[PDB]
């Protein structure tokens, strides 16, 4: 095994980095872009789709977590299958599934079938990072590989900004009407289509063929890589004189056995310590990262809610008689009023409350209320014609001789720009971290860079209390996102270089499934901290990153070594 790797490294080391490596970089960055787009689709869609689809808070949470659950299943499944079948073929299959179900997710009305479609889309896109990083690792020489794999993660933010821009440019056109958010989903499903469009024109990695005892195919693939690179390099005349490289229902059962055996061999005597340390590192970093990134927007929303409550105005002791009103109101409180013989036609309300009032012989007509309530009010001989006033809108009230007529239809649930801008800021703030990590991975080292980024993030977590205003949260989120990305780039580079080529996609995929599993738990735990002491998330995220840092330092070193 060690003898084959030395020979293979020489073939790529002599030929050098040419057009082929760049072409593959782009056609794989397309798939990473597809993943980066898919991660935000449900997030940007909930506020708009909450009305049409009659969604409650529990449904909002389930829709939030379904993408991560699908990615969790898909990472393991495609990682296991890629080793036995290949990298190109499994990437094609996974991305085709993603694109097809994402396309069918826009023309869906029901909530359960929408959840099912998003789950299958997540399953499809789950196999992006494992197959992409592995399949590209086999065209790079040890002279410079840490740098090359780091630039490969620059496309995830491209996907993120693409999704944010389309959300900003498609969602706010509420007047299109099938509403706009479906068109936004359809637009966001295009990167996967481009991924299959480009990926079908690239070869399967030589290493898979060599490991499967198909040396002829590896030879022709290396011949193609040599030809493409020599077509426009300094020296085009040298011929590929390298001879052959060293040679080393039923199908369903065979694949099931082989995938299980490959997964089990990762816990063997030689890959026990490495697997345990990587499990710990992946779990702890994923937990903190997802917890903080979903905790910041919730805090911003909470602060905005507090400011809105502080902006409310009260109107006490109003008496009205024989008047008509047709003017909108928002964020007001009316206490202790007396209305007799009034009319209310074409009235719109938003976060308006009425306390201790009294309506006698009134008449409502075409009134829509959002977060509007009647507390301790009294109605006598009042008529409600074509109104949205539901049963729960009256609290501690008494109705005498009143009547509802021609009641409106719609979702009975009561909940019938900043997010986009904040998400764009974070996705752009992850840039300098990526640049420094890419330029200094092979110089500083994978282990040192991982440890430094992890401890820096853990220390920066302590300054959460320093920011209390709305502007401070944005800066803190940007600072955390921009400095913690190097930790993930180093981890992706480290996980590839540790396991052998026979297991790298299975081993990377298993750990990525753990990453998604930890993300779900972190999201669930951190969403409930709001309304509680600010020190709790600080303590949790600091302890998690500390445990990650110690374990990460305890791993071995891989810089400057053949990819065995």
């Amino acid at each position, epitope marked *: 095994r060690e003898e084959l790797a030395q020979q293979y490294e020489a073939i790529l080391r002599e030929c050098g980095h040419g057009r082929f490596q760049w072409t593959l970089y782009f056609v794989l960055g397309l798939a990473l872009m597809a993943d980066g787009v898919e991660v935000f689709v449900v997030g940007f869609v909930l506020p708009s789709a909450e009305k049409d689809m009659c969604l409650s808070d529990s449904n909002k949470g389930m829709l939030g977590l379904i993408v991560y659950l699908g990615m969790m299943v898909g990472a393991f499944l495609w990682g296991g299958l890629a080793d036995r079948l290949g990298r190109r073929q499994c990437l094609l299959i996974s991305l085709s599934v993603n694109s097809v179900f994402a396309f069918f997710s826009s023309f869906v009305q029901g909530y359960g079938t929408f959840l099912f479609c998003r789950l299958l889309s997540g399953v499809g896109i789950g196999g992006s990072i494992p197959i992409v990083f592995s399949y590209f690792s086999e065209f790079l020489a040890q002279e410079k590989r840490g740098e090359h794999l780091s630039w490969l993660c620059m496309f995830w933010m491209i996907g993120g900004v693409y999704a944010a821009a389309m959300a900003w440019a498609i969602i706010p056109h509420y007047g299109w009407s099938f509403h706009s958010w479906r068109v936004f989903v359809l637009v966001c499903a295009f990167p996967s289509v481009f991924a299959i469009g480009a990926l079908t024109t690239q070869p399967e990695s030589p290493r898979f063929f060599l490991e499967n005892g198909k040396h002829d195919e590896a030879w022709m693939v290396l011949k193609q890589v040599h030809d493409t690179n020599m077509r426009a390099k300094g020296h085009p005349e040298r011929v590929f004189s390298v001879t052959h490289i060293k040679t080393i229902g039923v199908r369903a059962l065979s694949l099931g056995g082989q995938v299980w055996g490959n997964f089990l061999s990762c816990f063997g005597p030689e890959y026990r310590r490495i697997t345990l340390m990587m499990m710990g590192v992946w779990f702890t970093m994923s937990f903190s990262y997802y917890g903080l990134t979903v905790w910041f927007p919730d805090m911003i929303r909470h602060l905005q809610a507090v400011d809105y409550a502080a902006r409310t105005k009260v109107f006490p002791g109003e008496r009205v008689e024989h008047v008509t009103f047709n003017f909108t109101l928002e964020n007001q409180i009316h206490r202790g009023g007396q209305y007799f013989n009034d009319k209310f036609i074409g009235l719109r309300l938003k976060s308006v409350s009425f306390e201790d009032s009294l309506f006698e012989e009134c008449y409502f007509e075409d009134v829509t209320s959002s977060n509007t309530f009647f507390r301790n009010c009294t109605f006598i001989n009042t008529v409600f014609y074509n109104t949205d006033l539901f049963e*729960y809108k009256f609290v501690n009230s008494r109705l005498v001789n009143s009547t509802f007529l021609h009641n409106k239809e719609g979702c009975p649930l009561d909940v019938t720009y900043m997010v986009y801008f904040v998400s764009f800021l974070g996705t752009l703030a992850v840039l300098p971290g990526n640049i420094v990590s890419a330029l200094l991975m092979d110089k500083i080292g994978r282990l040192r860079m991982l440890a430094g980024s992890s401890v820096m993030s853990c220390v920066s977590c302590f300054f959460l209390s320093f920011g209390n205003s709305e502007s401070a949260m944005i800066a803190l989120l940007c600072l955390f996102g921009g400095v913690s990305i190097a930790s993930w780039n180093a981890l992706d580079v480290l996980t590839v270089e540790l396991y052998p080529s026979d297991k790298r996609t299975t081993a990377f995929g298993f750990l990525n499934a753990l990453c998604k599993l930890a993300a779900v738990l972190g999201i669930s735990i951190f969403t409930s901290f709001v309304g509680i002491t600010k020190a709790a998330p600080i303590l949790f995220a600091s302890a998690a990153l500390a445990l990650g840092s110690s374990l990460a330092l305890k791993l071995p070193e891989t810089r400057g070594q053949v990819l065995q």
Partner: nanobody, 121 residues
Framework: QVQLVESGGGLVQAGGSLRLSCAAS????????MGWFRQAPGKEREFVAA????????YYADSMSGRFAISRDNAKNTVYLQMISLKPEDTAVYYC?????????????????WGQGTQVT
């Protein structure tokens, strides 16, 4: 299917007071707008009073505010209709109904389930 039964009726001297208890069954009881209907001899069912899904708001019919009081107890899963100053005109079979809609309604067609009914003299 929610099963409703009413009890607490019985002959009452003029000007007295009486109570009727409408007990439901099943966990799903906070998702219905409870009501009370009565059917006098020779007349059709007429809506009397109703209470909200949380017991906070009441909904009385014309002239039924002052003699009839309606309340619900979620802990015991039951509804109470207190009547005072009973006159001979208040002779009927008082039914207990359930409505799953999100609006207060007086028509009997809108209400989903019904009760066995009890006689009040």
């Amino acid at each position: 299917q929610v099963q409703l039964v009413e009890s607490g009726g019985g002959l009452v001297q003029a000007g007295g007071s009486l109570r009727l208890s409408c007990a439901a069954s099943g966990r799903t009881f906070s998702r219905f707008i409870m009501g009370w209907f009565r059917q006098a001899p020779g007349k059709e069912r007429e809506f009397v009073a109703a209470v909200g899904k949380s017991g906070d708001t009441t909904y009385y019919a014309d002239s039924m505010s002052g003699r009839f009081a309606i309340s619900r107890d979620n802990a015991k899963n039951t509804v109470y209709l207190q009547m005072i100053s009973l006159k001979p005109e208040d002779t009927a079979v008082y039914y207990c109904a359930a409505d799953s809609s999100y609006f207060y309604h007086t028509h009997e067609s809108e209400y989903d389930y019904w009760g066995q009914g009890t006689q009040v003299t």
